[PDB]
Amino acid sequence: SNIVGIEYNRVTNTTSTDFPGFSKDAENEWNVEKFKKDFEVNISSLDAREANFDLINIDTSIANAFRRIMISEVPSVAAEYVYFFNNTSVIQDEVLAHRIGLVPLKVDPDMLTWVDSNLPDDEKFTDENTIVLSLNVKCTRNPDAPKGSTDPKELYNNAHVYARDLKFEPQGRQSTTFADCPVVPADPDILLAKLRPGQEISLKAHCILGIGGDHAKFSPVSTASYRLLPQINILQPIKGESARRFQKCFPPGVIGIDEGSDEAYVKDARKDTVSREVLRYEEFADKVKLGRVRNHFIFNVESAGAMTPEEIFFKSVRILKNKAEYLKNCPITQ
């Protein structure tokens, strides 16, 4: 079977069993035509920052590879070096640099070139491989302030250094390439720092592109994950008040009661988060069986704002294909 059964104390049938050698029939040999016929993609939602889509009739290894590549192998642009001029804040320089490196930047990674590490620092950063962001905030006491006010936004002028203060400074040909798509943070309301009068922040951040495995600030996804499609089988009819109890073991939109026969039936198993409450009660034993479809993945890819989640998934598929091609083209050394 292909249904991961869910019991009250254990999870059964979790390993894929589609390969020759599993049975004497010697079936499930790799055929690209059968996979092309069986594989399906169903898009349920496609927003600017979130995509939800079902992959049907694909193996667990490939879906997990897609998830891992989206998390740690798809490049994105984040701040890497911070040069400080007169950081007078109570926030330390290391903490402020870390926070600036953690903001997401709305830069297409395809427009930047990878930075050669072995090159010296005098010629390491070019206009093709570095984006310079300037921050300059001074806090002054407000003269036209309310008499009895206590809000920091009225007693002071720049008491909150936000992410939108990271202005973009074009360098060289970036004045033309970045003309229609200026560099802005994806979340301009990020509270980078708080100030009081007499305090000043002035800094230049060099931003490069890297992969999420090196540092978590380069991951282009808020979260990239999948969950198998739940499956509830009502083996025997459940009628009457118990059916109402059978409705309370699940989220409200999962299982409904027919008006005519007054019996419970599954309405939307997608909403069914597996809390396995129904297995606690002895009255529903030998009446309900829970499982998950092993080859029905529901990907929910939430982007960090740099680029669209569908682009992230496409880049992950392309990265896996390029890894396979690179290993195929390499010679084998003894």
């Binding site: 020759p20 050698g21 004497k24 029939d25 079936e27």
Partner: peptide, 12 residues
């Protein structure tokens, strides 16, 4: 090695 599919054995 598994028996080839289509052979006749006592397990049939």
């Amino acid at each position: 090695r598994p028996p080839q599919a289509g052979d006749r054995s006592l397990a049939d």
